Amino acid sequence: RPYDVVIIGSGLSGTMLGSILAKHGFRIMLLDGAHHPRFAVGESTIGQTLVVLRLISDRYGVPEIANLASFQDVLANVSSSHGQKSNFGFMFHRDGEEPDPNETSQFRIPSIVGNAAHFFRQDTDSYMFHAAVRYGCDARQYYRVENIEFDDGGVTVSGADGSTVRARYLVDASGFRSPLARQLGLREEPSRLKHHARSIFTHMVGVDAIDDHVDTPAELRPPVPWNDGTMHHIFERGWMWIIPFNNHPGATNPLCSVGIQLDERRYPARPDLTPEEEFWSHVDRFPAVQRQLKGARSVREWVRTDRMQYSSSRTVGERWCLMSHAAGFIDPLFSRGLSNTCEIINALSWRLMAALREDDFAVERFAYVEELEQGLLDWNDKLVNNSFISFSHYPLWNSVFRIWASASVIGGKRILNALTRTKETGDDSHCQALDDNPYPGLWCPLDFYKEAFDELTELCEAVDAGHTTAEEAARVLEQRVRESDWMLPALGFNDPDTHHINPTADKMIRIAEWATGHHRPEIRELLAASAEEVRAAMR
Amino acid sequence: RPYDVVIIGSGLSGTMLGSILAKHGFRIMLLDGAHHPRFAVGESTIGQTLVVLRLISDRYGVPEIANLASFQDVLANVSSSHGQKSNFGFMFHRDGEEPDPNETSQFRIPSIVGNAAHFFRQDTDSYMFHAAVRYGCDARQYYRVENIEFDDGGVTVSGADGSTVRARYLVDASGFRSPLARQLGLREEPSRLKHHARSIFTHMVGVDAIDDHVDTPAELRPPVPWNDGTMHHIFERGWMWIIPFNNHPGATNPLCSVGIQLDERRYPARPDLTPEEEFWSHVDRFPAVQRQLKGARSVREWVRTDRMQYSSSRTVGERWCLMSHAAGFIDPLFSRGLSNTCEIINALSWRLMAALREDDFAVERFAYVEELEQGLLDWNDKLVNNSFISFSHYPLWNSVFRIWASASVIGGKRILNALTRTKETGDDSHCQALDDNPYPGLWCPLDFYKEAFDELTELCEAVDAGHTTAEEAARVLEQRVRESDWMLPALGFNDPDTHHINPTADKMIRIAEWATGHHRPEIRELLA
Numbered sequence A: 001r002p003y004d005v006v007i008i009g010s011g012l013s014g015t016m017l018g019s020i021l022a023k024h025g026f027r028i029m030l031l032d033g034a035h036h037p038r039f040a041v042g043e044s045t046i047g048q049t050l051v052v053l054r055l056i057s058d059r060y061g062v063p064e065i066a067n068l069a070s071f072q073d074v075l076a077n078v079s080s081s082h083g084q085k086s087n088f089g090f091m092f093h094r095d096g097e098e099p100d101p102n103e104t105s106q107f108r109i110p111s112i113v114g115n116a117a118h119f120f121r122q123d124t125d126s127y128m129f130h131a132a133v134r135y136g137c138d139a140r141q142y143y144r145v146e147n148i149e150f151d152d153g154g155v156t157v158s159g160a161d162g163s164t165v166r167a168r169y170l171v172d173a174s175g176f177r178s179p180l181a182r183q184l185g186l187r188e189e190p191s192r193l194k195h196h197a198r199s200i201f202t203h204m205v206g207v208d209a210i211d212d213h214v215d216t217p218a219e220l221r222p223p224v225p226w227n228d229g230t231m232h233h234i235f236e237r238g239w240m241w242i243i244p245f246n247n248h249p250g251a252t253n254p255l256c257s258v259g260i261q262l263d264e265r266r267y268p269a270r271p272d273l274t275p276e277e278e279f280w281s282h283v284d285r286f287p288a289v290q291r292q293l294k295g296a297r298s299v300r301e302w303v304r305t306d307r308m309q310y311s312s313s314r315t316v317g318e319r320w321c322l323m324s325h326a327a328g329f330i331d332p333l334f335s336r337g338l339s340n341t342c343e344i345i346n347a348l349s350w351r352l353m354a355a356l357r358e359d360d361f362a363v364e365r366f367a368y369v370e371e372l373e374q375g376l377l378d379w380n381d382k383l384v385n386n387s388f389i390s391f392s393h394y395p396l397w398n399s400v401f402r403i404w405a406s407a408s409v410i411g412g413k414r415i416l417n418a419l420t421r422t423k424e425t426g427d428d429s430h431c432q433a434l435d436d437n438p439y440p441g442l443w444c445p446l447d448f449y450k451e452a453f454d455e456l457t458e459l460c461e462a463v464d465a466g467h468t469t470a471e472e473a474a475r476v477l478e479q480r481v482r483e484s485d486w487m488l489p490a491l492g493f494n495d496p497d498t499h500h501i502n503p504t505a506d507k508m509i510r511i512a513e514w515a516t517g518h519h520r521p522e523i524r525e526l527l528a529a530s531a532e533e534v535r536a537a538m539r
Numbered sequence B: 001r002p003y004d005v006v007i008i009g010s011g012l013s014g015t016m017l018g019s020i021l022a023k024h025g026f027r028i029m030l031l032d033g034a035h036h037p038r039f040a041v042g043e044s045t046i047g048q049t050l051v052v053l054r055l056i057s058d059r060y061g062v063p064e065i066a067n068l069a070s071f072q073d074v075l076a077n078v079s080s081s082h083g084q085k086s087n088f089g090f091m092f093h094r095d096g097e098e099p100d101p102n103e104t105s106q107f108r109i110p111s112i113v114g115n116a117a118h119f120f121r122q123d124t125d126s127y128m129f130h131a132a133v134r135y136g137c138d139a140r141q142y143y144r145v146e147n148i149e150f151d152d153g154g155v156t157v158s159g160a161d162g163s164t165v166r167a168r169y170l171v172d173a174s175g176f177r178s179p180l181a182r183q184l185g186l187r188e189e190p191s192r193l194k195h196h197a198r199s200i201f202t203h204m205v206g207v208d209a210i211d212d213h214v215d216t217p218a219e220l221r222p223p224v225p226w227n228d229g230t231m232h233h234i235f236e237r238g239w240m241w242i243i244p245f246n247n248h249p250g251a252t253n254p255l256c257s258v259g260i261q262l263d264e265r266r267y268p269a270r271p272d273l274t275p276e277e278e279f280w281s282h283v284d285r286f287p288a289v290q291r292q293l294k295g296a297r298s299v300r301e302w303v304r305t306d307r308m309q310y311s312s313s314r315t316v317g318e319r320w321c322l323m324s325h326a327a328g329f330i331d332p333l334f335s336r337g338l339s340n341t342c343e344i345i346n347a348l349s350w351r352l353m354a355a356l357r358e359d360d361f362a363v364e365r366f367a368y369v370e371e372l373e374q375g376l377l378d379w380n381d382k383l384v385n386n387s388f389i390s391f392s393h394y395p396l397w398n399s400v401f402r403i404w405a406s407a408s409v410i411g412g413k414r415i416l417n418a419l420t421r422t423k424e425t426g427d428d429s430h431c432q433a434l435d436d437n438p439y440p441g442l443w444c445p446l447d448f449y450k451e452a453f454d455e456l457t458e459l460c461e462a463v464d465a466g467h468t469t470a471e472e473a474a475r476v477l478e479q480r481v482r483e484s485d486w487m488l489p490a491l492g493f494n495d496p497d498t499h500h501i502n503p504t505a506d507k508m509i510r511i512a513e514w515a516t517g518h519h520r521p522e523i524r525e526l527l528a
């Protein structure tokens, strides 16, 4: 009679979980206040999300999830309406000034982690919702949750329409408005998080490529276009994203995702301005951004937020789980959101199914999911807070950037090797061993990385508290980078004067040779391979 | 400052018009109570909408509109999420019986009118909205219109949010909930319309091809698959549509639009059943349909309507126009809605731009728009009412089917020829001349067609009233078909025994030969 699981929120987190549970013969109800199709933000993918999507798909036997793990599979299976992401781009702007071409950074994503996308979320979320319903999930859309009641036998969810849903377990896969977080008072008030930012964002038609509106010397031009990736316009205590859906030949979607993050402590609310007027007031500060957006028109009602950050004291209890985005949020910066979502679905799914099967809901079974959830948010907090502090001074940012981007290659390889070894042998142990790491939520959980990132964090926070200058901090971190032995030297991560990291087959072969003889066992374990093996992997 | 035009409704009708006006430099506001993306019904295209989309695009210089006129251009420019429509398929079903393979119709759409599509309307409507804004239309979404107030100088639209919009002209491009039709008391109550039907519809995943679930003898299989077009499951005083979006290799959209039309005088309201329950209670009547939909699951909240038909006493005034779907509606049958929409945009757009330029809003300039609006509805009403009556007797439907479909090529080539003339001469003259026909709103407005359709209508209504037998009507109409000289003989339209009309290159060439030396001037003018 009762549902096994009621999932509140029919976005990607809810429908990926619902697809896994429904495919394995469980009885699922998806509840959402909205109806597909609908706009959702969280558009840019990273290497980690790609490999973890593939990992979830293989581990739980849901092919539809692996179709989100590459630009090619999204186009072929979801819709034509998505953009490519070959790179992360960063460009510093000062008020009334042209951008300095020596204050840019680019990370071109290596082929081995896969081909990143700009997700048009209305289509990815419709796609996974249709998959969830096809696997046997029941759904109620335009369904507002008013009340959640727990007893010894399960949970009762009451709608505004006067109806009730009875289930054995509740997953809240909503956002800030999480009905469960409100019902149980799970929100930390005030929030423990150090990062401060509010947002203004929309979708625009007629956004130009930044590549066509900057006066850059031929030799300082990036190896791949800015417009082929996620462009980050950096300024004092804020940044603006430019995420085109039309940045490839014969792209059907003419839209561009556009938003600004502002630290609300340094940029106070302007309720006298409309969202759009406040957006353009920031555009008009930066001549090159003004030229890029000159013909850009909003095709949506603007979103303008207060401080966006939130955190929870508890994310799992008896017969309930708070999914990543319902538990906490930092910032769009670095697109950690969808990675965190995938880490939690991987860890939760087999634990929840074992609990449902045994009919045992002891919170002890979900202890790792709590630890991972809080760890992801706290590590994500430091990375973004460190970046926002560094935006005041490029030589400081320059260290943040290569420490972040180096870990993205080492971290991705770690998850890809585990997945590869699990497919070769059929032994799930290689994937389960990922959970046995000392730093749950850290994207590259190795002692030498933890130590480098702790020192980065200590110095950035010192700059923010006024204990040290951005210059002082930049000098110390630049020397540490220059003294490093682990920062993938063939790719240029250990060279502060290399601003555009451009992986090529030749450099990836050299990394494998460099790794073979390395004194660090983790470098050998993750990166060591013959020339022939690296070519075999790139086929 | 003031807008030139405020358009209420950001569906295709509103954004195609806003795109036209904004491209010609007029200042446009689009208001809508919803936000893109959003589901809309009206998914199947016909020859007439394709050729009139091409006409609008070429005549008003908006290329985006022409990308709706071809399955290939829809996939290349809108999104991958649309299906193909190679044909109209018709299958008769009786309660508890297998479909009779001698009680089916197919009209395969000829190359000349173009490649029809199954529109995933969330994507077409998003595309035209994006085009309209790019041309320079302003827009407010989640905007609920509370009051519309005209004066000598223009109109004021008041919003729930306490804001107002000032413009010189208002177009209502919404639907049945038209605020202009409501606030001005424009609705005919009761409606003058003869057709009666209510609807239940949704989008489903896991709908199979009917081709794979019927035991048809090889020699009675259609030239092209049923699943490659819009299938109509016909029964006593009702029909069901299957409009797949996945009916082509490497289709990205797995959904299928499914809906049932019921004459509510013959099938009274079942408020004891959920919409889904009432839908399945009709599926369970017909074993073949039941097998097709066996694994099908809905991905939307179901829509269930009361009687869907509505009409208006007036569709134009001083500084306002009621756009086709805001003015009236008959039925999804034969997909006339988007044709009606395109015809009105073609007739309205040049007159309106002339009025804005001259700052003269005398309603007499818009008299033809009114005549076309009411004419489309009246002719559409007869087409569908005649069809619903004929569903009781296949031999009678067989006559309705060929009289309707024979008009596709003839009415199609009429609009093509006018478009070709205007392209070569560069004179809008030859498109304006389409407004000078003697039967505004009739899809083939020639005396010999008007007379043939008039007789079909008189016989069908006499069957409905019980004055003439369905059998009597079928024999008289079968005789008129067999004795006709105009019903494109080479395609089999004049042959009641030809159920599957399959226009090939060989047959279309023969049509051209036969036309060249025809006694009727219209046949020569159109098909030679």
Ligand SMILES: Cc1cc2nc3c(=O)[nH]c(=O)nc-3n(C[C@H](O)[C@H](O)[C@H](O)COP(=O)(O)OP(=O)(O)OC[C@H]3O[C@@H](n4cnc5c(N)ncnc54)[C@H](O)[C@@H]3O)c2cc1C
Residues within 6 Å of the ligand: A008, A009, A010, A011, A012, A013, A014, A031, A032, A033, A034, A040, A041, A042, A043, A044, A045, A143, A144, A145, A146, A173, A174, A175, A177, A178, A179, A199, A201, A308, A323, A325, A326, A331, A332, A333, A334, A335, A336, A337, A338, A339, A341
């Ligand atoms: C401005 C912004 C930018 C971001 N950018 C990125 C990025 O670039 N990359 C990235 O990886 N991540 C990004 N993120 C994070 C990203 O949004 C999430 O990680 C991702 O969308 C996960 O979505 P979800 O399925 O968990 O939930 P969502 O997609 O947020 O689903 C929320 C659902 O909750 C429902 N709901 C709410 N209240 C109720 C109720 N009472 N009853 C019923 N239903 C209810 C709503 O109807 C809605 O459908 C961004 C986030 C924000 C806010």
Ligand SMILES: Cc1cc2nc3c(=O)[nH]c(=O)nc-3n(C[C@H](O)[C@H](O)[C@H](O)COP(=O)(O)OP(=O)(O)OC[C@H]3O[C@@H](n4cnc5c(N)ncnc54)[C@H](O)[C@@H]3O)c2cc1C
Residues within 6 Å of the ligand: B008, B009, B010, B011, B012, B013, B014, B031, B032, B033, B034, B035, B040, B041, B042, B043, B044, B045, B143, B144, B145, B173, B174, B175, B177, B178, B179, B199, B201, B259, B308, B323, B325, B326, B331, B332, B333, B334, B335, B336, B337, B338, B339, B341
């Ligand atoms: C069940 C059904 C099936 C149909 N099937 C077909 C078919 O197969 N083929 C075909 O050619 N035609 C079909 N039609 C007809 C077709 O739907 C219309 O001709 C077509 O949608 C016209 O488009 P539009 O832009 O005028 O209106 P719509 O598509 O109805 O869009 C109207 C817009 O106005 C907005 N709006 C509505 N009310 C208000 C308000 N009060 N205030 C503000 N905004 C408002 C809506 O949010 C929406 O965005 C069908 C119609 C129905 C009802």
Ligand SMILES: [Cl-]
Residues within 6 Å of the ligand: A331, A332, A333, A334, A335, A336, A337, A338
């Ligand atoms: Cl994020």
Ligand SMILES: [Cl-]
Residues within 6 Å of the ligand: B331, B332, B333, B334, B335, B336, B337, B338
């Ligand atoms: Cl219609």
